[PDB]
Each structure stands twice: as structure tokens, then as C-alpha cells.
């Protein structure tokens, strides 16, 4: 029942707050206006957890990334309202075909000069140096602007041909970057000259340059419309004009459109759209803000038709069309950080123009932290994870999505462990990989008592459990028929005569007070409860937003072996119903469900497999046979070749390496699976394999059971006439690709047979998957 707004402190917050009081007048809703430091990236963190302001104000360049992460709500404007604003302003706030924010103002930088000191402002950048020396004789300077933010330096960088990214037939091509172009080098090299010819100071930030121009110590500055207000109260005659040209071509400022976005987790979205559509985006509202600190050009054609008469706004628009309109694609944050570091370093002489800017082509589209090598060193997105020793399993634990057990068996879990040491577990089964159509549900009741740490599985806790009962409920009329029949064949006599099962009725499959049981029919076992591990992550170091993950024992890939299978690895984690990720919608749906009302998971569309690229593990993976490992895969779709790195460790946190395997080969794209809905079949050939021992124990064993092996030396295992390996080896694989909540792609490969054997025959292809790998940059 409130409205919180975040706006940068270089804009008119008090003006916006006054459009807010009129909201309080007509509707009685408080509007609170805050200008947090570095708000552009306070927003991604607080919003990801469900928190944050209701409305976020920023240029369009950063909103595409917010939307990709699911932080922005789609805005619902009437076509009548949409006509009020200019089409290009809407085009800037459009991501993936959806409108994601309300356009407010069009901003571009311009040349601001003191007419008293400089009645005729320079027309070219190259005449600035001589101009400097010979105002320098009067104890003044020619040009001073903020060199700490690349927004103020870009105009010069783009003049000769430096292009942030390439616009190709309606697309911005992140594979065509021009920060290391010859054109970019010229602009930065020129800037460096002035910084080295004592014409400009490397330290100069916004505050320093603003103080100088507004006190007449410099004759020129580069700034935006927001800056005009203070100069106006600086008793200094000043003019706004076109930016100096560089090497005959004009300075190209990056054009940004100030926009208001509605938090995807806002409880007051109708009020937010109400405040923006009918209070702010009005001739009265925009004026109230433009009086505080000028917005320059505006998106409302009504007000724009009037402001365009002010010559400052016209120069703003002249430079804007001389410039380029910022892309909203999510790679902008990495583009800005790379160009930022380039400028600060070359200005400081830390890196040669070419060298500093050379890195900008290696860091433009992706953060260094998104590269495969960093992700391997900092797992879980560099989260700290605290392991609960001894674990506490009390609470409600739910699945995070549509799990796949071997079979395939598409299912979700809902497990309640009580303080009396008793438990009620729901296993919901479905007919598809979307978990939208329940087939049958299992209700498992019994008792569980945690023991002590496992000496077999490092990081696991052993547990003892006892079943009291297993019941099954069929949710379709067909399932009741099929299962009753399957129960009949499997245990002839379990079903009394004329007892065809009916839907929505719980039937006993296992009672501890009887020797009559047919758990074999569904190949049921509950040995997952014998191995337990809890991992916590406290986001923002707070108990709230804490994510608790419960890891239970893994399921055998062969259903007939589950009764005897004695866990050595983990199932995918469950999350605590009270302490889960805000983006987990499945958690809540599963939490609010029961044996008679199964959880219906949100529909997501099957994605098409695009192996091209590099993929790495997200966590220290645990494979059957207590094997800790991470994986790095490189897929060449150009020649259908693949390389894989398997890094093995002895600890559940993957810090003590033991051995490393390198494999390379060829793969054949295959057919969509009919056995495993949502999966695509593949055949992989391993042609080459290299082994690197990483500890003395592995080197010793290799030397004993065998080119002598030593720690850290990679050795091919195929000589010309090791451990008995047989290369070439053929593998029949199953693959699926999905997208996580902030739009990163996940690659799932076939679960490795629980017995340790290989899928070396088509009938041995997996019907389940391993934990997903995430896409990374090289
Ligand atoms: O310098 C990189 C940043 O450029 C723009 O930030 C501008 C912004 O558009 C303007 O309203 C503000 O007041 O000035 C800053 C530059 O200091 C992008 O919008 C940012 O996302 C970039 O990081
Ligand atoms: C992924 C298909 C080929 C896998 C063969 C690579 C060399 C075999 C040694 C690694 C163990 C098998 C694990 C492969 C499964 C995977 O990690 O994707
Ligand atoms: C254990 O506690 C739960 C929660 O109060 C309750 O539903 C269940 O019946 C209890 N069982 C026993 C044996 O006390
Ligand atoms: C159970 O299976 C047996 C053998 O397949 C069959 O003869 C019998 O008819 C089945 N039960 C029913 C009631 O169909
Ligand atoms: C496949 O292509 C990659 C790069 O596209 C190259 O490095 C590799 O040598 C090629 N392999 C074969 C067998 O053509
Ligand atoms: Cl992709």
C-alpha cells in the first residue's frame, strides 16, 4: 500500500517527490523518493531476493539485463498512452518484444563553455591544446570533465570508428566489437596526449570538473542536462553547443533514455503504473522535475514540442543524433566495466592505450568472472556455503523443479520431518518432463534418526529410518487401471477379486503390520534417507534470504536395484519451504500441495540443443562411488568435435585435487528422444585421453600398474605398442538444455550408470541426467 522510488542523485529527486505529494493528495498513497549510492547495482541484488524499490529510475542501457534476470515487470500501457510518447523512446525500453519500463527523458552530453572566457568555443578537439596554453597564460584552463566514468570519454573514442557493438540487420552483434578498432585507439590516444601534455588531469572526476567550470577556472566542460541547473546558480554566462569534432568526424555521444521500471516483486504495480502514466508523464509532472534539475529532451511529445524551443535542448538533440542510442542488451554492464578500466588505466599510464584497450575486446561482452577458469575456481557463483554439521532435517523440504529419476520418472518431492523424529514424504509422479499432468502420488510415512558423519562419503551424515506405511493415490482414471493391473501381475493376490482401483483413493502398498506388500510393482525404496547433508547460503549475511538445501541419497539408475542400493552420492537438493530462493516458483506450488491436490508446475517450453561453446560445473559434483569432481566441456559445432576436462578431488568442496582426465573426440547430433521427453539423443566417440596425476598416491599407483608418471605431468594413455583402458570408446548420450532464472543456459548430460559401468550400447543410454553445467566464456 506504498510507493518507493529510486532515482539517481544527479537528477531532480525533490521534483519527483513533489509529483509524489500530488499522489498523496488525490489517492492518499505515500510516495517516498530515495537516491541511493550506486543504485544501478544495488537494484540487481535487493531485487533478486524479492526486495527493492517499487519503481527504479535509470537509463535504458541497464534495463535489458534487469529483465533477463527477471527483476522487471512488463509494463501495460494503453495504445492511447503509447501515442503520447515518441516511438524511439519505446524502442529503447523494449526487451524480448516486451515493454519493460516507462520512457521519461532523452539525454546526451554536450559541450558547455564560458562565453566570457571563450566567446567562440573550439570546433575541433585538435585545437584544444593550443587554446589551453594560451588561456593558461591568464591562469585558467580550456577543458575539464569527469575522466572516471567512461560515459564522458566515449564520445571521443567513437569518433574515428570505435564501435561498442555492431548493429547487423536488427541485431546488436556481440561478436563484432570495436573498442580495439583503429578508430577507438585514436580517441583514447588523443585523450592520453592531453593528460600527458599537462592539458588535463587524470584525477578529475565529476565533482572536480563541476567545481572548476562553475567557478570559472575552466572554460569548457562535457556534461548532460542535469548539470545545467547548478551552472545557472553559478553566476557564470555559459553556452551549450555541439561537441568538438575529432579528425574531421563529429564526437558521437552514447544516447540514453531515462526510464522508470516497475519491480517484478512489487506488491503495488497498479499504483506504480498509475503514478507514472497519469501523474509523472504529464506536462505538469515532467516540468516539476525539469525545474529541479533539467531533464533536457523528454519522451512526452507534448512537453518536448515546447522544450525543443530552448537552445540547450536542441544542442542536446543535435549531439544525440550525431551520436548513437545506447543498446539495452544485458552485456552493457560488462562493456562499461571494461571501457572504464581501460580509460582509468591508460590515463594513469597503467596500461598502454593498445594494451589497455586490447583487454576491452577480451572483456567487452563478458565479465572476467563469467569465464570458465574463474567459475571453476569459485563455484556456486562464488557463494559462501556453510555446511550444517551436525545436520538438522526438521522442517518442510520441497523440490525446485520437475526432477527426473531413472526410468524415466518425472517427479517432485515434498518431505516433512517432524520433531518427534517422524516423517511424511510426498513423491508426486507425472507423465511428462513439464510436471503438469500428475499420474500417481506416493505417501511415505515412518521414523528417522540422524547418526554421525560418514567415513565413506566425506561431508555426508549417516541416518537410520523405519517405514510405517506406503500408500499410492491415482489422479487419472487411466492410471488407476494401469497400476492396479501392474500390481496384479507383480503380486497376484495382493488385490482381492472385483477390486479394480479407482482414482483419488489411497491404497496401501506397504504396511508394517502385515507381510502383504507390493512395493516391487513400482520398484520403490526409501534408502535415500540414509545419507544426509545440509548446505546453507546466507545472502547479504542475513538469516532472512537464507537458502537452505537438503541433499539426500542418490537413486539407482536401474529401478530393479534400488531395494539393495545403498547411497554413495546425492539427489538434486531440496530447498526449505521456509528458506528458499525468491525465484523458486515451484517451491511454493509444491509447498501448498497434498496427496489429493498435486502440485502443477509452471509450463516452460522445451529448448532446442545448442552445444556450441564452453560449459563448466556449478558445484563440486558428487558421482556414485563417492567421486568428487568438476567438469569443463568445449563443443565445436563447426566440425562436431568435443573436448572434456574432468577434474577429480578428494573433498566435497573440490580443493584437494587427486587426478585430472582430458578427453577429445567427435559427436553426432541425433534425434529427439521418445523414451525421455525433453531429451535429445547423441553418440559420442572418445578418441584421445590424457591423464594428469595430481598427488603422489595417484602417480605411484599408475607407475605400479603400468613414460613414467609424475605429479603435474599430463600423459597420453595411448602409446605406440595404460591401466587397461580401451580407446576408441563409444558412448550413447542424452542431453537437454534449459534456462535458469537470470537467463543463463544449463547443459544436462546423461546420468552415469550407478554401478560405475559405461553407456557403451544404445540400450544403456541414460533415462536421467547429471547436475547441470552452466555456460561460460573463454
Ligand atoms: O559511464 C558508464 C555509464 O554510462 C551511463 O551512465 C550515465 C547515465 O546515463 C546518466 O544519467 C548519469 O547521470 O551519468 C552516467 C555517467 O556517469 C549508463 O547509463 C550507465 O549504466 C553506465 O554505467
Ligand atoms: C561425455 C561423453 C564422453 C565421455 C567420455 C570422456 C572420458 C571418460 C572419462 C570421464 C567419465 C565419463 C563421464 C562423462 C559424462 C560427463 O561428464 O558428461
Ligand atoms: C509428530 O508431530 C507431528 C506434528 O505435530 C504430528 O502431525 C504427528 O502426528 C506426530 N506423531 C507422533 C507419533 O507423535
Ligand atoms: C491378474 O493376472 C493374471 C495373470 O496374468 C490374470 O489371469 C488375471 O486375470 C489378472 N487379474 C485380473 C482381475 O485381471
Ligand atoms: C575443429 O574446429 C576447431 C575450431 O573450430 C579446431 O581447433 C579443431 O582443430 C578442428 N578439428 C578437426 C578435427 O577438424
Ligand atoms: Cl546457446
**Domain-ending residue, one of 591, 623, 654:** 591
In a domain, 349, yes or no: yes
Do 219 and 361 lie in one domain? The reply is yes
CA 269, 271, 277, 279 dihedral sign is negative
Q: Give the integer Cα–Cα distance in Å for 261 and 257.
A: 12
Do 190 and 259 lie in one domain? The reply is no
Nearest C-alpha to atom 1 of ligand 2 is from which residue?
684
Q: Give the integer Cα–Cα distance in Å for 317 and 342.
A: 28
Do 242 and 150 lie in one domain? The reply is yes
To test ligand 5's pocket by mutation, which of 611, 634, 639 has the most ligand atoms within 8 angstroms of CB?
A: 639
To test ligand 4's pocket by mutation, which of 480, 481, 484, 489 has the most ligand atoms within 8 angstroms of CB?
A: 489
Retrieve residue 110's grid coordinates: 554536450
CA Rg value for the chain: 32
In a domain, 637, yes or no: yes
Do 264 and 394 lie in one domain? The reply is no
The angle that helices 353-363 and 332-347 make with each other, rounded to 10 degrees, is 170
**CA distance readout (Å), 333 to 47, 89, 94, 149:** 17, 21, 17, 13
Do 29 and 99 lie in one domain? The reply is yes
Q: Give the integer Cα–Cα distance in Å for 168 and 388.
A: 52
Do 265 and 187 lie in one domain? The reply is no
- Measured in Å, residue 507 CA sits from the centre of ligand 3 at 22
Do 507 and 542 lie in one domain? The reply is yes
In a domain, 421, yes or no: yes
In a domain, 607, yes or no: no
* Domain count of the fold of the chain: 4
Confirm or reject: Cβ of 418 under 6 Å from ligand 3. Answer: yes
**CA distance readout (Å), 538 to 386, 583, 736:** 9, 16, 31
Q: Give the integer Cα–Cα distance in Å for 668 and 686.
A: 12
| Residue 745: φ, ψ to 5° | -85, 140
**CA distance readout (Å), 3 to 32, 99, 111, 274, 278:** 6, 21, 37, 11, 15
N-to-C CA span, the chain? 47
Nearest C-alpha to atom 17 of ligand 1 is from which residue?
149
In a domain, 219, yes or no: yes
Element (H, E) at 362: helix 353-363
Decide: helix, strand or coil at residue 570: strand
Determination technique for this PDB entry?
A: X-ray
**Residues 357 and 188: beta-carbon distance below 8 Å:** yes
Q: Give the integer Cα–Cα distance in Å for 186 and 353.
A: 9
**Residues 240 and 228: beta-carbon distance below 8 Å:** yes
Contacts by 133-139 with C-beta closer than 8 Å and gap 24+?
135/219
Ramachandran region, residue 227 (left: φ > 0; alpha: ψ -120 to 50; beta: rest): alpha
Q: Give the integer Cα–Cα distance in Å for 732 and 642.
A: 14
158: Cβ contacts below 8 Å, ≥ 6 apart: 164, 183, 184, 187, 251, 252, 254, 323, 324
Do 422 and 486 lie in one domain? The reply is yes
Do 286 and 219 lie in one domain? The reply is no
Question: Which residues have CB under 6 Å of ligand 1?
Answer: 8, 10, 40, 59, 61-62, 107, 149-151, 226, 256, 336
Q: Which residue shows C-alpha cell 543498446?
A: 327
Query: What's 96's domain CATH number?
Result: 3.40.190.10
Closest CA to 547 of 397, 344, 325, 722: 397
Resolution of this PDB entry, in A? 2.3
Q: Give the residues after which the backbone of the chain is interrupted, taking a C-to-next-N distance over 2.5 angstroms as a break.
A: 706, 721
Decide: helix, strand or coil at residue 339: helix
In a domain, 21, yes or no: yes
Do 413 and 469 lie in one domain? The reply is yes
Nearest C-alpha to atom 12 of ligand 5 is from which residue?
639
Closest CA to 506 of 483, 536, 532, 540: 483
CA atoms within 13 A on the CB side of 710: 3
Q: What angle do CA 417, 423, 428 make, to 5 degrees?
A: 95
Do 436 and 459 lie in one domain? The reply is yes
Do 707 and 574 lie in one domain? The reply is no
**Domain-ending residue, one of 556, 591, 626:** 591
**CA distance readout (Å), 361 to 174, 192, 327, 335:** 10, 19, 17, 9
Strands (E), 49-173: 55-59, 94-95, 98-99, 102-107, 110-114, 141-143, 166-168, 171-173
In a domain, 264, yes or no: yes
In a domain, 135, yes or no: yes
Closest CA to 534 of 713, 391, 652: 391
185: Cα separation from own chain's centroid: 32
CA atoms within 13 A on the CB side of 2: 6
**Residues 160 and 247: beta-carbon distance below 8 Å:** yes
Residues with CB under 5 A from ligand 6 (ion): 610
Question: Which residues have CB under 6 Å of ligand 4?
Answer: 488-489, 492
**CA distance readout (Å), 181 to 279, 324, 353, 538:** 46, 17, 12, 44
Q: How does strand 438-453 pair with strand 461-474? A: antiparallel
Domain that holds residue 542: 386-591
Amino acid at each position: 500500500g506504498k510507493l518507493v522510488i529510486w532515482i539517481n542523485g544527479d537528477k531532480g529527486y525533490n521534483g519527483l517527490a513533489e509529483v509524489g505529494k500530488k499522489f498523496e493528495k488525490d489517492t492518499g498513497i505515500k510516495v517516498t523518493v530515495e537516491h541511493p549510492d550506486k543504485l544501478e547495482e544495488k537494484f540487481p541484488q535487493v531485487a533478486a531476493t524479492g526486495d527493492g524499490p517499487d519503481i527504479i529510475f535509470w537509463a535504458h542501457d541497464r534495463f535489458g539485463g534487469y529483465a533477463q534476470s527477471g527483476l522487471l515487470a512488463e509494463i501495460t500501457p494503453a495504445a492511447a498512452f503509447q501515442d503520447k510518447l515518441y516511438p524511439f523512446t519505446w524502442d529503447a525500453v523494449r526487451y524480448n518484444g516486451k515493454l519493460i519500463a516507462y520512457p521519461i527523458a532523452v539525454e546526451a552530453l554536450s559541450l558547455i563553455y564560458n562565453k566570457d572566457l571563450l566567446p567562440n568555443p573550439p570546433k575541433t578537439w585538435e585545437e584544444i591544446p593550443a587554446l589551453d596554453k594560451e588561456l593558461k597564460a591568464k591562469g585558467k584552463s580550456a577543458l575539464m570533465f569527469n575522466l572516471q566514468e567512461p560515459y564522458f570519454t566515449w564520445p571521443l573514442i567513437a569518433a574515428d570508428g570505435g564501435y561498442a557493438f555492431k548493429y547487423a540487420a536488427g541485431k546488436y552483434d556481440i561478436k563484432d566489437v570495436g573498442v580495439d578498432n583503429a578508430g577507438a585507439k585514436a580517441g583514447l590516444t588523443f585523450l592520453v596526449d592531453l593528460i600527458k601534455n599537462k592539458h588535463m588531469n587524470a584525477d578529475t572526476d565529476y565533482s572536480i570538473a563541476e567545481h572548476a567550470f562553475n567557478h570559472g577556472e575552466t572554460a569548457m566542460t562535457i556534461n548532460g542536462p542535469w548539470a545545467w541547473s547548478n551552472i545557472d546558480t553559478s553566476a557564470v554566462n555559459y553556452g551549450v553547443t555541439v561537441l568538438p569534432t575529432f579528425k574531421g568526424q563529429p564526437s558521437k555521444p552514447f544516447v540514453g533514455v531515462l526510464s522508470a521500471g516497475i519491480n517484478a516483486a512489487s506488491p503495488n504495480k497498479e499504483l506504480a503504473k498509475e503514478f507514472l502514466e497519469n501523474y509523472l508523464l504529464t506536462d505538469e509532472g515532467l516540468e516539476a522535475v525539469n525545474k529541479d534539475k533539467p531533464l533536457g529532451a523528454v519522451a512526452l511529445k507534448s512537453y518536448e514540442e515546447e522544450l525543443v524551443k530552448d537552445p540547450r535542448v536542441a544542442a542536446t538533440m543535435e549531439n544525440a543524433q550525431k551520436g548513437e542510442i545506447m543498446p539495452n542488451i544485458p552485456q552493457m554492464s560488462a562493456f562499461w566495466y571494461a571501457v572504464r578500466t581501460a580509460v582509468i588505466n591508460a590515463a594513469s599510464g597503467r596500461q598502454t592505450v593498445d594494451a589497455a584497450l586490447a583487454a576491452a575486446q577480451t572483456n567487452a561482452a563478458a565479465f572476467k568472472e563469467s569465464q570458465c577458469h574463474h567459475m571453476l575456481k569459485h563455484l556456486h557463483n562464488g557463494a559462501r556455503i556453510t555446511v550444517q554439521m551436525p545436520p538438522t532435517i526438521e522442517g518442510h523440504w520441497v523440490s525446485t523443479g520437475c526432477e527426473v529419476r531413472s526410468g524415466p520418472e518425472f517427479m517432485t518431492r515434498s518431505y516433512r520431518f517432524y520433531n518427534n523424529n517422524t516423517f511424511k514424504a510426498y513423491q508426486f509422479y507425472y507423465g511428462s518432463n513439464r510436471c503438469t499432468n500428475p499420474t500417481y502420488t506416493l505417501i511415505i510415512r515412518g521414523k528417522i534418526r540422524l547418526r554421525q558423519a560418514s567415513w565413506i562419503i566425506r561431508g555426508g551424515t549417516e541416518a537410520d529410518y523405519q517405514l510405517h506405511g506406503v500408500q499410492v493415490i491415482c489422479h487419472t482414471e487411466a492410471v488407476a487401471e494401469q497400476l492396479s493391473r501392474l500390481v496384479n501381475r507383480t503380486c497376484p493376490g495382493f488385490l482381492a477379486p472385483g477390486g479394480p482401483w479407482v482414482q483419488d483413493v489411497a491404497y496401501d502398498l506397504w504396511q508394517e503390520e502385515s507381510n502383504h506388500e507390493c512395493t516391487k510393482a513400482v520398484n520403490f525404496a526409501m534408502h535415500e534417507l540414509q545419507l544426509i547433508r545440509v548446505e546453507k547460503q546466507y545472502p547479504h549475511h542475513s538469516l532472512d534470504h537464507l537458502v537452505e538445501e537438503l541433499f539426500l541419497g542418490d537413486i539407482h539408475t536401474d529401478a530393479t536395484q534400488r531395494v539393495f542400493y545403498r547411497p554413495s552420492s546425492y539427489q538434486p537438493p531440496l530447498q526449505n519451504a521456509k528458506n528458499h530462493n525468491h525465484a523458486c516458483i515451484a517451491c511454493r506450488i509444491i509447498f501448498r500441495s497434498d496427496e489429493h491436490h498435486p502440485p502443477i508446475l509452471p509450463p516452460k517450453a522445451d529448448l532446442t540443443i545448442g552445444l556450441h561453446g564452453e560449459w563448466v560445473s556449478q558445484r563440486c559434483e558428487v558421482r556414485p562411488e563417492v567421486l568428487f569432481l568438476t567438469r569443463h566441456f568445449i563443443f565445436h559445432d563447426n566440425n562436431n568435435t568435443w573436448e572434456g576436462h574432468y577434474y577429480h578431488y578428494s573433498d566435497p568442496v573440490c580443493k584437494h585435487p587427486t587426478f585430472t582426465i582430458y578427453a577429445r573426440g567427435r559427436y553426432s547430433r541425433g534425434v529427439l528422444s521418445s523414451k525421455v521427453m525433453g531429451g535429445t539423443e547423441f553418440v559420442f566417440k572418445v578418441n584421445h585421453m590424457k591423464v594428469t596425476p595430481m598427488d603422489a598416491a595417484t602417480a605411484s599407483l599408475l607407475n605400479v600398474f603400468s613414460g613414467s608418471w609424475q605429479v603435474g605431468i599430463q600423459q597420453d594413455v595411448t602409446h605406440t605398442n595404460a591401466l587397461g583402458i580401451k580407446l576408441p570408446h563409444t558412448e550413447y548420450e542424452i542431453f537437454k538444455m534449459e534456462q535458469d532464472t537470470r537467463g543463463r543456459y544449463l547443459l544436462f548430460n546423461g546420468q552415469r550408470p550407478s554401478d560405475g559401468s559405461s553407456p557403451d550400447r544404445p540400450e544403456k543410454r541414460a533415462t536421467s541426467y547429471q547436475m547441470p553445467l552452466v555456460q561460460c566464456a573463454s
